[PDB]
Structures are given as C-alpha cells and as structure tokens.
Amino acid sequence: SVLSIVTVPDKRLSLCSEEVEKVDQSIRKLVDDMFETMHANQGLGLAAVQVGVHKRILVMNVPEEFEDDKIEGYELYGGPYCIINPKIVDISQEKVKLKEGCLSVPGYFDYIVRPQRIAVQYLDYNGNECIIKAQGWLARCLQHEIDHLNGTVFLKYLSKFKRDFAIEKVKKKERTDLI
Amino acid sequence: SVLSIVTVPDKRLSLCSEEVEKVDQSIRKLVDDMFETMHANQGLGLAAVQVGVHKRILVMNVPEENVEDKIEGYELYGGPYCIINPKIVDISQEKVKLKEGCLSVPGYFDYIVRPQRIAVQYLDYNGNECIIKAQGWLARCLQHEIDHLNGTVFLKYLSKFKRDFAIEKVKKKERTDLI
Numbered sequence: 001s002v003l004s005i006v007t008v009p010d011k012r013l014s015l016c017s018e019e020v021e022k023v024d025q026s027i028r029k030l031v032d033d034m035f036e037t038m039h040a041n042q043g044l045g046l047a048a049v050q051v052g053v054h055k056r057i058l059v060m061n062v063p064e065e066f067e068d069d070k071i072e073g074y075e076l077y078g079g080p081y082c083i084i085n086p087k088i089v090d091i092s093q094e095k096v097k098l099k100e101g102c103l104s105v106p107g108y109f110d111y112i113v114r115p116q117r118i119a120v121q122y123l124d125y126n127g128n129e130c131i132i133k134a135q136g137w138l139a140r141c142l143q144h145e146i147d148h149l150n151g152t153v154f155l156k157y158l159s160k161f162k163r164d165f166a167i168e169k170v171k172k173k174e175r176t177d178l179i
Numbered sequence: 180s181v182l183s184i185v186t187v188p189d190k191r192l193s194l195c196s197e198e199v200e201k202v203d204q205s206i207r208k209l210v211d212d213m214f215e216t217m218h219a220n221q222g223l224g225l226a227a228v229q230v231g232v233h234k235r236i237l238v239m240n241v242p243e244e245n246v247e248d249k250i251e252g253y254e255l256y257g258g259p260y261c262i263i264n265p266k267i268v269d270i271s272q273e274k275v276k277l278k279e280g281c282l283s284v285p286g287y288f289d290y291i292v293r294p295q296r297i298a299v300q301y302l303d304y305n306g307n308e309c310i311i312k313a314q315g316w317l318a319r320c321l322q323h324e325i326d327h328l329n330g331t332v333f334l335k336y337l338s339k340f341k342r343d344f345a346i347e348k349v350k351k352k353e354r355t356d357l358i
C-alpha cells in the first residue's frame with residue numbers, strides 16, 4: 001500500500017517522534033507500507049512522520065553509483081534498511097556539503113553540510129539489535145532521515161530567505177495544481 | 180520559584196521534548212525556575228520535562244576516578260550551565276560504569292554504563308551558540324539529562340526487576356508514613 005506524504009509547511013513535520021516500545025506485527029506492516037511508498041516515489045529515504053505517524057522508524061535504500069575506499073566495517077551504499085529507534089554512537093568531525101532533496105519538500109533541492117560518517121545503533125525489522133556504520137550517501141540519507149524523527153526538515157539549515165522561498169514554492173505548485 | 184518535580188511512573192517522563200524555536204524571556208524564566216528547583220532539591224542536573232514542560236532545555240551544576248583518563252581540554256566539572264537544543268557532535272567509544280541518581284526517581288541509585296566523554300553544541304541563556312567538551316561527572320550528568328529530553332529515565336538500562344523495584348521504592352517513599 002502506497003501512502004500519502006505530508007509536505008511542508010504541515011506542522012506535523014515539526015513534532016518529535018516517539019520511541020517504538022516493541023517491534024510487533026503492526027510495526028512491520030507500517031514498515032512495509034513506508035518502503036512501498038518510498039519506492040513508488042523514487043526516494044532513497046523515508047521517515048514515519050512523513051506518512052503521518054510520529055514513531056522513530058525510517059527506511060532507506062541507497063543504490064550503488066553507476067560507476068564510470070571504505071573504512072573496514074563501513075558502507076557507502078546499500079539497503080533496503082529498516083531502522084527503528086536509532087541511536088547515534090559515533091559521528092565524524094569531517095563534514096561534507098551535498099545536494100539534498102526530500103519528498104516533504106517536493107521540487108526543491110539545496111546544499112547541506114553534515115558529518116561525512118556516522119555510526120548508529122538500532123532495532124531492525126526482526127526486532128534485533130544492529131549497528132550500521134555509514135559513509136558517503138548512506139551516511140547522508142541516514143542523518144537526513146534521523147532529522148525527521150526529531151522534527152527537522154532540511155530547510156532548517158538554510159537561511160530564512162531560502163527556507164521561505166522553498167515553502168512558498170511547494171504551496172504555489174499545490175495552488176497552481178488547483179486552477 | 181521552586182517547582183514540583185514529575186516522578187516515575189508519570190507517563191510524561193516518557194514523551195520526547197520539542198526543539199525551542201526562540202530563546203525569549205519566557206524561556207529564561209523557565210530556566211531560572213529550573214535552577215532554583217535544582218538547587219532546592221540538591222541536584223546536579225535537571226531537564227524541563229522533569230518539571231512538566233516538554234522542551235529541549237536542561238540545566239547542570241557540577242561542583243569540584245582512575246576509571247577515566249583525564250583528557251586535555253575537556254571539563255570535568257563546572258556550571259551553572261543552561262543548555263538548550265543540545266546537539267551531540269562527538270562521543271567517546273570508551274565507556275565507564277558509574278553510580279547515578281535522579282530527582283524523578285527519588286531514593287534510588289544504580290550503576291549505568293555510558294560513554295566517558297561527549298562534545299555538545301547548544302544555545303545558552305541568551306540564545307548564543309556554544310560548545311561544551313565534557314568528561315568525568317560533567318559528561319555523565321550531561322548525558323543523563325539529554326536522555327530525559329528523549330523520554331528516557333535511567334531505569335531503562337536496568338533489568339526489569341530493578342526498574343520496577345526502584346519505581347515501587349518511589350511509590351512507597353512518597354507516602355509519609357502514619358506512625
């Protein structure tokens with residue numbers, strides 16, 4: 001089932017998401033829907049708040065670059081990942097500027113600086129404890145999605161001028177769609 | 180002004196706290212009250228949620244271990260600290276086992292394993308960007324309080340028997356006994 005996506009400036013995107021008490025059948029079904037929704041919209045990541053549910057769950061799928069080094073244990077790509085209750089346990093001092101987009105801010109893309117590498121503990125689809133050590137786009141996607149769980153969209157890091165233009169561009173597309 | 184402290188098993192202690200949008204006079208007043216409430220109850224730290232407000236604000240005062248290396252340039256004690264919107268930007272992989280208490284779990288103490296050192300970016304009392312590089316008890320307290328902002332009391336890391344023993348100790352300790 002392909003779910004509807006909450007878009008800015010919907011205030012639901014600004015509220016923090018709660019911890020999942022246990023990974024049961026009902027969490028798995030939500031995770032299936034979230035993944036189907038992400039794949040249907042051609043996204044690399046998706047937080048539950050983006051489908052209207054305030055729980056600390058995200059899914060990711062970062063394909064390998066069509067190619068024209070890693071630290072031992074780290075990954076630059078992969079998935080699908082189901083990441084529940086993520087906890088940051090290590091984060092790089094080195095930062096990288098990359099272009100980001102988001103399904104909750106459709107049609108707007110901008111450059112954001114974040115740590116290059118991050119290690120995160122989480123519960124997986126099966127309810128088992130895991131660790132993901134992430135670099136490159138995998139680390140990028142993961143931090144972007146963790147922001148959603150804390151009630152943060154990537155516009156927060158931009159100047160007020162760009163943020164407001166972004167929000168007004170999302171709405172003008174929706175208002176122009178209704179002419 | 181001395182506020183009443185929310186104590187376990189109050190469900191409010193399990194909800195996540197929200198980002199503070201602007202550090203205005205209403206925020207400083209809440210911080211003033213949190214300091215007074217902390218001093219009055221003999222505490223080293225306090226999160227806003229412990230006084231019933233779900234916002235990302237904590238205060239600490241740690242006054243002046245062969246289980247930890249003393250690292251140059253990290254604070255072992257100090258304060259008073261007003262820490263708003265804390266963001267963890269670095270965290271040690273070395274950990275340490277230390278005894279903790281909590282004003283929301285009065286009368287109960289136990290040993291908890293946490294990272295030895297943390298670096299945290301934050302806004303201070305006047306809304307200015309700051310950074311704290313903490314170790315020793317300063318970092319233990321800071322981590323304990325950040326946990327509250329995320330809906331976690333230290334009983335989470337203990338076995339269920341101990342968590343429920345502690346909670347029962349609180350329920351009994353809150354009755355002044357009719358002798």
Ligand SMILES: [Cl-]
Binds near residue numbers: 086123
């Ligand atoms: Cl976890």
Ligand SMILES: [Cl-]
Binds near residue numbers: 265300
């Ligand atoms: Cl900050």
Ligand SMILES: [Zn+2]
Binds near residue numbers: 101103104144145
């Ligand atoms: Zn997004």
Ligand SMILES: [Zn+2]
Binds near residue numbers: 280282323324327
């Ligand atoms: Zn506490």
